[PDB]
Amino acid sequence: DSCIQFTRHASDVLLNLNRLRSRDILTDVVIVVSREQFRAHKTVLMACSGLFYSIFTDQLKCNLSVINLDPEINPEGFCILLDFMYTSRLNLREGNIMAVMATAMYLQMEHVVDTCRKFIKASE
Amino acid sequence: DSCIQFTRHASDVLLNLNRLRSRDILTDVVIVVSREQFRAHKTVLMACSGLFYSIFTDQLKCNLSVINLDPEINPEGFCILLDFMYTSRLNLREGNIMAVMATAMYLQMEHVVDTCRKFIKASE
């Protein structure tokens, strides 16, 4: 086509989706990770994670307001990945890398798994 | 903070939100523009338009499944802007610029209004 493109559009959309999340506006699911609960937008979760894409395209699970993750999942690791989904920013640290990598593998977030593998290999 | 950032993340999220829209997955509103209907995600509309942000943060309108736009709004102009919301790509042409600009003013999409004004000024 003969379209023009606004370079910052995708980043501005994501910034606004994060603002809606922070204000709990039109959030439609709560992700339960052991004792912790995280409110989010199903569409953002699906757009970022192979696992959520699978869950919310399921004819029964698409209608659930609560999703319980595997008990082995670390809440902090999930929190870091949820923030990454809404911001493109990953708070990767020596103290959380193993938890973040395990959570990204479970959530099927290949690019996160890739940088965790690379950061781990550099430290050995 | 000491975060790392994935450059293509925002663009990949938007591409997936557009894929969900094309497959009518978790769309939660229909925008009626005279004889035409457009299915969308309320969160994407709010993230792109001052008008939809106002509408869906309203305590009564947030729960509506159908929104009727002003009869003066051109369906093609709306279609072009809806595509832009989900892709960052604006199909701006000599034959549609007036309709696109009027629709962007109504929808409160300042960056679109700006490029329409600039393209019009260059042709006079």
Binding site: C3, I4, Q5, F6, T7 | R89, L90, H111, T115
Partner: peptide, 4 residues
């Protein structure tokens, strides 16, 4: 705005 750019030509993509």
């Amino acid at each position: 705005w750019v030509i993509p």
